[PDB]
């Protein structure tokens, strides 16, 4: 009757709403040729498209929050769920809780313990008198010197398979049909607020799931100025994530050339014991070049003054205290798990623009039996590695905390953070968020129908 | 692919077609690469069933006999296609969206096909 237009259905209109879905992984279809019996994640893991597509959306402004990002939570539970699936088929070490008779190794206060103990053979009749070599961190005495496994009173224990490797490989997160992933292309982005230039991708960039504390290793570099990120900045309870401009060369080696016993606890099962150490008598150490660490510090200390004020004193110091995972730099190199003393790097005091040799070193401790992510009921034994392990990684960022003692208007001190591994994933995921596409739409037009 | 999302609705009608489309024996992660694509085909058919039961029965664009109510975004035609964008458009209709949906399935394909059956007898 009254004119004019009529409703009309449009399919595929550009309308999306912020939402959450279940994301899968992608390995680049080369990681599969890397083989070594299912390295890390990739087994049936989806091959990445040789030509990923990134579409820049013009005349668009979208508001991002990285701390509210849901992609982080899936990845955190993924690595955890990934971890258990790796330890299920492997050999369980349950009857290793046998009494340990230990003694001091032939310098640096006997960090290594030579332990003799009784063990079950293939046959169920006669036991086996054999010795092994454990770090001081893996054992605890109970009251010659008698020791025991450190994890036995807390939980059970299982050995990781020598076939698989913990080597981080690039993993692309993609979204299923009907969804989309937004990417923030600005050079300077702190993870909160509106984003001027936004592009969309089916898959996120190459992300190496490197689990580390107090140091972001093998991560993505920032653009131009170094970045400063915090959930709540003025709040001293929230950690402060830092993104580096130039990568920092770091060396961590295992200056112990070792051998594998490969003792037989059959039928069919074989445990890899740590034999005698042939080589340098040394404790594990981590190298950082004095010139390269300082330059970054000088550029970073200036960025904190875009918040804490033009002029103020910023002092750095080592970890306050807590669990070993919190107080030291924890990571994996060559299959072994290093815990490094970062106290030497964080000893400095800075002026407004400045601070008042050719190398630096960091003492590292080795622990084979670990419970990360506060896991109880499952302890993983890192198998020994033949020969000396040497590794070189990039230091791409930090986890930092601010002191609560204030004296807020006087000076501020920062210390290396730890704990939550989500922050590590938030470091790479800050520029991405998940939305679902709503294709269906209605618009008024004259066509009507016959 | 979404390129006109920032552009006006009038320009957004040209690229409409691109938006339509972009061992397996594992015990675990097999459910992770499955559960995602299964709800995808469930979400896919969810939209398509609506397209059939309405006056469309076909994809892309299709029209209907439902008259546009003035009370629903009273506007200028050039104020819609030429001056306005889809994200900005779906924002206002958000209240009347469920109302419009009813007019397509009820007022049309329920009352139209029956109307058609009566017009097909003679």
């Amino acid at each position, epitope marked *: 009757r009254a004119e004019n237009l009529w409703v009309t259905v449009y399919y595929g209109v550009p309308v999306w709403k912020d939402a959450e879905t279940t994301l899968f992984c992608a390995s680049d279809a080369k990681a599969y040729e890397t083989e070594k019996h299912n390295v890390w994640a990739t087994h049936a893991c989806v091959p990445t498209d040789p030509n990923p597509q990134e579409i820049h959306l013009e005349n668009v402004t979208e508001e991002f929050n990285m701390w509210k990002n849901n992609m982080v939570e899936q990845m955190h539970t993924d690595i955890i769920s990934l971890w258990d699936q790796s330890l299920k088929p492997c050999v369980k070490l349950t009857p290793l809780c046998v009494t340990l008779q230990c003694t001091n190794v032939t310098d640096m206060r006997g960090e290594l313990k030579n332990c003799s103990f009784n063990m079950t053979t293939e046959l169920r009749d006669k036991k086996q008198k054999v010795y092994s070599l454990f770090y001081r961190l893996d054992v605890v005495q109970i009251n010659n010197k008698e020791y025991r496994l450190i994890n036995c009173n807390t939980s059970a224990i299982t050995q990781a398979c020598p076939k698989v490797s913990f080597e981080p490989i690039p993993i692309h997160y993609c979204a299923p049909a009907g969804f989309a992933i937004l990417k923030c292309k600005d050079k300077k982005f702190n993870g909160t*607020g509106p984003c001027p230039s936004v592009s969309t991708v089916q898959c996120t960039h190459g992300i190496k799931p490197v689990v580390s504390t107090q140091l972001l290793l093998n991560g993505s570099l920032a653009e131009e100025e170094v970045m400063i990120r915090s959930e709540n900045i*003025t709040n001293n309870a929230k950690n402060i994530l830092v993104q580096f401009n130039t990568p920092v060369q770091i060396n961590c080696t295992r200056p112990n050339n070792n051998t594998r016993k490969s003792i037989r606890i059959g039928p069919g099962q074989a445990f890899y014991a740590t034999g005698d150490i042939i080589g340098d008598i040394r404790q594990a150490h981590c190298n950082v070049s004095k010139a390269t660490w300082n330059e970054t510090l000088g550029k970073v200390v200036k960025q904190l003054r875009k918040h804490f004020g033009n002029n103020t004193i910023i002092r750095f110091a080592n970890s306050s205290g807590g669990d070993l995972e919190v107080t030291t730099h924890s990571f994996n190199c060559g299959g072994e798990f290093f815990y490094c003393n970062t106290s030497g790097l964080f000893n400095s005091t800075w002026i407004s623009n400045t601070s008042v040799n050719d190398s630096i070193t960091l003492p590292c401790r080795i622990k084979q039996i670990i419970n990360m992510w506060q896991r109880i009921g499952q302890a993983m034994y890192a198998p020994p590695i033949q020969g000396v392990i040497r590794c070189v990684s990039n230091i791409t960022g930090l986890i930092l905390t601010r002191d609560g003692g204030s004296t807020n208007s006087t000076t501020e001190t920062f210390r290396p953070g730890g704990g939550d591994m989500r922050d590590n994933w938030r470091s790479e995921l800050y520029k991405y968020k998940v939305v679902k596409i709503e294709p269906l739409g209605v618009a008024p037009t004259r066509c009507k129908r016959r | 692919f979404l390129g006109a999302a920032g552009s006006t609705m009038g320009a957004a009608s040209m690229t409409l077609t691109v938006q339509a489309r972009n061992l397996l024996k594992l015990t675990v992660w097999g459910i992770k690469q499955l559960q995602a694509r299964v709800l995808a085909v469930e979400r896919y058919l969810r939209d398509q069933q609506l397209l059939g039961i309405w006056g469309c029965s076909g994809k892309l664009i299709c029209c209907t006999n439902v008259p546009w109510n003035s009370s629903w*975004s009273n506007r200028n035609l050039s104020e819609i296609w030429d001056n306005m964008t889809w994200l900005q458009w779906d*924002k206002e209709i958000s*209240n009347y969206t469920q109302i419009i949906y009813g007019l397509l399935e009820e007022s049309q394909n329920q009352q139209e096909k029956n109307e058609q059956d009566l017009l097909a007898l003679d």
Partner: antibody
Framework: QIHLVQSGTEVKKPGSSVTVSCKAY?????????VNWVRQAPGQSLEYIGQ??????????HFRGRVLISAVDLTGSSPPISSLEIKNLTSDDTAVYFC??????????????????????WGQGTLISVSA | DIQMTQSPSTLSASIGDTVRISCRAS???????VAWYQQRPGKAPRLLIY???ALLGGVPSRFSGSAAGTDFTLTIGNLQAEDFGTFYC?????????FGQGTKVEVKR
């Protein structure tokens, strides 16, 4: 939670310039939160002055250019602060001024409508009495 | 530039009563962009309902909005003591936002 604490009572004479500040407590940033300045004449209704949104200052055609709204984000020593300056003060400006904010993160929220929006959080208010 | 008209400017109502305060806009507002505020004397105004029917979180269920075209109305059932004060209607439909005359809800006795 969200708390907006404004400056003290300002009594200034005509022709002078007045600056009020709004300290926004509980707000993570002004990127996800738009700030609007609204005044209320005594015994009269409310009037929209201006806003700062996505770090872009804006104001009504009444006050265009005569009103300046500036804001700095969350710092290490204090919460996010916004400031309003009014030069060429007159006797008709004696309204009570309010510092307001609104959550813009929800893109399909009914709070906002492309710059023009409602006001979720209200401040303590600041009275400006202009008299010679 | 929209102009908001409220009726009445003030009213006398008792406790338990159902109070209806209407408002009319100089033009037709669709998408229903309209807000209602409550202000107790001497205190800053608080946001109650946005988009005309949408009640804010933490607000009692006794408050109800209605929005159609040029004519808008806010309905309050079971009036109580804390509800008394001055109420305002606001349109964010177009730049800039404009408020209403205001309505003073006054105790009956």
């Amino acid at each position: 939670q969200i708390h907006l604490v404004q400056s003290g009572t300002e009594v200034k004479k005509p022709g002078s310039s007045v600056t009020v500040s709004c300290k926004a407590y509980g707000v993570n940033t002004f990127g996800l939160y738009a700030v609007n300045w609204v005044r209320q004449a005594p015994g009269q209704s409310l009037e929209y002055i201006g806003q700062i949104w996505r770090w872009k200052s804006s104001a009504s055609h009444h006050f265009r250019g005569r009103v300046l709204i500036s804001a700095v984000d969350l710092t290490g020593s204090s919460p996010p602060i916004s400031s309003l300056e009014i030069k060429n003060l007159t006797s008709d400006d004696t309204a009570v001024y309010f510092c307001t904010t609104t959550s813009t993160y929800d893109k399909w929220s009914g709070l906002h409508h492309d710059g023009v929006m409602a006001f979720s959080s209200w401040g303590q208010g600041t009275l400006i009495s202009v008299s010679a | 530039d929209i102009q908001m008209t409220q009726s009445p400017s003030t009213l006398s109502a008792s406790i338990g009563d159902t109070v209806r305060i209407s408002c009319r806009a100089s033009q037709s507002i669709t998408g229903n962009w309209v807000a209602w505020y409550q202000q107790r004397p001497g205190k800053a105004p608080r946001l109650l309902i946005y988009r005309g029917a949408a009640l804010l979180g933490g607000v009692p269920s006794r408050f109800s909005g209605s929005a159609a075209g040029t004519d808008f109305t806010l309905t309050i059932g079971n009036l109580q003591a804390e509800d008394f004060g001055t109420f305002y209607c606001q349109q964010y439909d177009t730049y800039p936002g404009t408020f209403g005359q205001g309505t003073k809800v006054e105790v009956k006795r």
